[PDB]
C-alpha positions as MATLAB code, in Angstrom:
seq = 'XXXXXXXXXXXXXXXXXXXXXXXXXXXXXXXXXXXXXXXXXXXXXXXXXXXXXXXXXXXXXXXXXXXXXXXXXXXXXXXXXXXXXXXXXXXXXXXXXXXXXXXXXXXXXXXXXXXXXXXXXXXXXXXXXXXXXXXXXXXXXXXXXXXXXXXXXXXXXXXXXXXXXXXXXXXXXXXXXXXXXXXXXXXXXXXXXXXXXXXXXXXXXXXXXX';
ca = [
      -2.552    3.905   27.066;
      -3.552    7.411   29.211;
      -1.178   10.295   28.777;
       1.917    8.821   26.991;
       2.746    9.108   23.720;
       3.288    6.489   20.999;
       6.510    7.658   19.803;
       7.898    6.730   16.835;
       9.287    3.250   16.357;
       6.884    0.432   16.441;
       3.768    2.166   15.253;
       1.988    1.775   12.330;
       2.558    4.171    9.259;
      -0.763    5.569    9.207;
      -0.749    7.099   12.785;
       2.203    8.765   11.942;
       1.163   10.642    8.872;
      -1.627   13.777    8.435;
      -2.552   16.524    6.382;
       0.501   18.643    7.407;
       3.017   15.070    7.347;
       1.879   13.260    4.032;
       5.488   10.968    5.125;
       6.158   10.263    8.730;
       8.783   13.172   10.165;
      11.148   10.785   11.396;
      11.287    8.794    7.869;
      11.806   12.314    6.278;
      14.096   13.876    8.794;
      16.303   10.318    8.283;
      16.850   10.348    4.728;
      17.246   13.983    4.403;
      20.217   14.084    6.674;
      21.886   11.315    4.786;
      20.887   13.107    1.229;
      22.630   15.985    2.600;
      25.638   14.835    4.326;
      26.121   10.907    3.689;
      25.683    9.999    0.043;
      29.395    9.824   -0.661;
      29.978    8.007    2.187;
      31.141    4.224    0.985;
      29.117    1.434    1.838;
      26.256    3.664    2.709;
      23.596    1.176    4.650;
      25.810   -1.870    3.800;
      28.369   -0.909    6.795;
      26.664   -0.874   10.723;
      26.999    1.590   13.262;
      27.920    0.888   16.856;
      25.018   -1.158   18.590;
      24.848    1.468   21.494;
      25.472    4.588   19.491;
      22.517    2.974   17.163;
      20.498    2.562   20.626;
      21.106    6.160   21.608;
      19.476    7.458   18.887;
      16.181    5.091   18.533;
      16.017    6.724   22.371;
      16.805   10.293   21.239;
      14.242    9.982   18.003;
      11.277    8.012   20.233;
      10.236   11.221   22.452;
      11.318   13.917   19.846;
      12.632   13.335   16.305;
      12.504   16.935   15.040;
      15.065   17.997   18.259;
      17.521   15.610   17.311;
      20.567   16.735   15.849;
      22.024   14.309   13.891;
      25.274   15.573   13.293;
      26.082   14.259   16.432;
      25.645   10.799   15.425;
      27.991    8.800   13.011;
      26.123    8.241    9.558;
      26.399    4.559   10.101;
      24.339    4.632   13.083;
      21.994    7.146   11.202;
      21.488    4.570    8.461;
      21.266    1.992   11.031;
      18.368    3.263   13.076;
      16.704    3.818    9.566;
      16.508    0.442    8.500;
      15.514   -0.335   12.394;
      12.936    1.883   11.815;
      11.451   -0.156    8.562;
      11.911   -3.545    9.969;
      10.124   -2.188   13.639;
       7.101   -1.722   11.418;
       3.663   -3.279   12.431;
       3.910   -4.566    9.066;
       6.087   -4.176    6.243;
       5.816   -0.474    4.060;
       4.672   -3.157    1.091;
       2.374   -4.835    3.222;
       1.447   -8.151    3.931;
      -1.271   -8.221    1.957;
      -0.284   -7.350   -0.987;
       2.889   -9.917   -0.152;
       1.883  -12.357   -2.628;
       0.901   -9.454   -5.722;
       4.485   -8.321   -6.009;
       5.517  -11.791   -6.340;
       3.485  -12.727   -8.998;
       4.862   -9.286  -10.738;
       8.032  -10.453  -11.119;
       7.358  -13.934  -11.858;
       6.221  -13.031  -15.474;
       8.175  -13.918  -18.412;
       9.437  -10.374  -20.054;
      10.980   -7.337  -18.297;
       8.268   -5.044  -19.606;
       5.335   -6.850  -18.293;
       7.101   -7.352  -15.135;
       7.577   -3.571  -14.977;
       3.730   -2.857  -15.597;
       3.088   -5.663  -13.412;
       4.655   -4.235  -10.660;
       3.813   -0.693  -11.040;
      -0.098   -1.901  -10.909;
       0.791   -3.426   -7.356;
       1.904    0.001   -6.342;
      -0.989    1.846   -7.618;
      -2.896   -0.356   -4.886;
      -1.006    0.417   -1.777;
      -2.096    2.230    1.187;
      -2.113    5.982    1.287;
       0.640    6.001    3.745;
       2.587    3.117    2.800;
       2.955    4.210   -0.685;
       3.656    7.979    0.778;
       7.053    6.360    2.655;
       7.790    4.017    0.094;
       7.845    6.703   -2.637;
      10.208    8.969   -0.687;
      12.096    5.847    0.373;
      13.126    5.100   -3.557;
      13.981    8.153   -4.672;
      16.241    8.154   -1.482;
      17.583    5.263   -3.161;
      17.874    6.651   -6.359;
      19.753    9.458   -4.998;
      22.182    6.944   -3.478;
      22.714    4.568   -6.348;
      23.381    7.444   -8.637;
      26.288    8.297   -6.582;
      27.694    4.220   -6.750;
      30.913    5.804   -8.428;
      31.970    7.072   -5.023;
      29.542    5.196   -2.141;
      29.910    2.272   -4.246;
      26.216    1.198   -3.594;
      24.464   -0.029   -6.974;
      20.818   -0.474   -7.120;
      21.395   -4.498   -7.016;
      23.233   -4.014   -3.694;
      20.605   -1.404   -2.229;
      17.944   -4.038   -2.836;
      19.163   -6.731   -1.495;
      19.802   -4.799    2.104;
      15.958   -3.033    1.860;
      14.151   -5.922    0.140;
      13.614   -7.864    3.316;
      12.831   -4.088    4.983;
      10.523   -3.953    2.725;
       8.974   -7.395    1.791;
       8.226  -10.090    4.696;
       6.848  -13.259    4.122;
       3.232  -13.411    6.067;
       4.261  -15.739    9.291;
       1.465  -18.586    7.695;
       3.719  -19.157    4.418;
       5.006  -22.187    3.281;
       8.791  -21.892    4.624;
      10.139  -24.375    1.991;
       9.262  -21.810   -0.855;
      10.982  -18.605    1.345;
      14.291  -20.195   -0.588;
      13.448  -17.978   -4.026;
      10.882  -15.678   -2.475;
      14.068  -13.603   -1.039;
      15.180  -13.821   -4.613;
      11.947  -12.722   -5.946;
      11.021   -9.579   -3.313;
      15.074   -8.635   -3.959;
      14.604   -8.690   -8.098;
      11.092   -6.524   -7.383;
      12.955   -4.071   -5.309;
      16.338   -3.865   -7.563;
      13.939   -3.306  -11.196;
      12.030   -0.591   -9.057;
      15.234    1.881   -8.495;
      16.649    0.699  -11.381;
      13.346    2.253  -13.548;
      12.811    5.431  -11.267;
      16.638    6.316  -11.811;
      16.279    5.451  -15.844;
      13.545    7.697  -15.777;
      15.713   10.135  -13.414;
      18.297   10.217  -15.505;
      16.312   10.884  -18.702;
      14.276   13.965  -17.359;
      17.941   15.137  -15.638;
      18.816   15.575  -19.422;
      15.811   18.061  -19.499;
      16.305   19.486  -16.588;
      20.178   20.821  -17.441;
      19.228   22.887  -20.023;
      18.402   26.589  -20.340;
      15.584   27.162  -23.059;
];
């Protein structure tokens, strides 16, 4: 493809991180904005944006994502074009791969082992992958901490990025998909949950002067 330029959407994570961008500058520039202008806004990526506002700026971040200024554009659209942005990818930030691992996590018996479990799948993702995905959660984190006022809890934030996240490889068996979206929503939900438990206990260190 001589002379034009990839963009942004529809490209795989990799080619859009380097040693100066360890997380893609449209993933970054995304949940920043929202972090710093839309985390008490209620129903944060539960309610949509308007379809053509939403368009607009999947046009405006394709050539140029850093010129875009996205106070311009109503949050709901911002969070919109975000989740666009995970579900236009190649393949999945978890992978397809690796699909099948974070099922079996969360199919053992006790909490604690399903933790572990889990944690071990993550240790084995892809540089970049794992690079969005971290920044991703603790965007999440940030969100669900504020569920007093946006009223999003961690349970309700996984189910709307689990299937963002998680997809089935297209050569499944369709007749088990019925508790896989169960199972990739329970992985998701125990992940924030634990990062903001662990959030919450180093705040505690954090607010204190000597």
């Amino acid at each position: 493809f001589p002379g034009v330029e990839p963009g942004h959407f529809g490209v795989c994570v990799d080619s859009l991180t380097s040693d100066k961008a360890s997380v893609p500058i449209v993933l970054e520039k995304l949940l920043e904005h929202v972090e710093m202008h839309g985390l008490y806004t209620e129903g944060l990526y539960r309610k949509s944006g308007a379809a053509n506002r939403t368009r607009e700026l999947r046009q405006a971040l394709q050539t140029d994502p850093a010129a875009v200024k996205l106070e311009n554009f109503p949050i709901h659209a911002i969070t919109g074009v975000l989740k666009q942005w995970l579900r236009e990818l190649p393949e999945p930030l978890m992978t397809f791969a690796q699909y099948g691992d974070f099922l079996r996590a969360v199919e053992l018996p006790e909490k604690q082992e399903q933790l572990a479990a889990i944690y071990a799948v993550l240790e084995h993702l892809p540089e970049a992958n794992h690079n969005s995905l971290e920044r991703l959660i603790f965007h999440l984190v940030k969100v669900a901490l504020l569920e007093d006022v946006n009223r999003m809890s961690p349970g309700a934030l996984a189910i709307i990025f689990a299937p963002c996240l998680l997809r089935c490889p297209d050569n499944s068996d369709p007749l088990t998909s019925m508790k896989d979206v169960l199972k990739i929503t329970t992985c998701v939900e125990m992940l924030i949950k634990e990062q903001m438990r662990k959030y919450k206990v180093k705040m505690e260190e954090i607010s204190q002067l000597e």
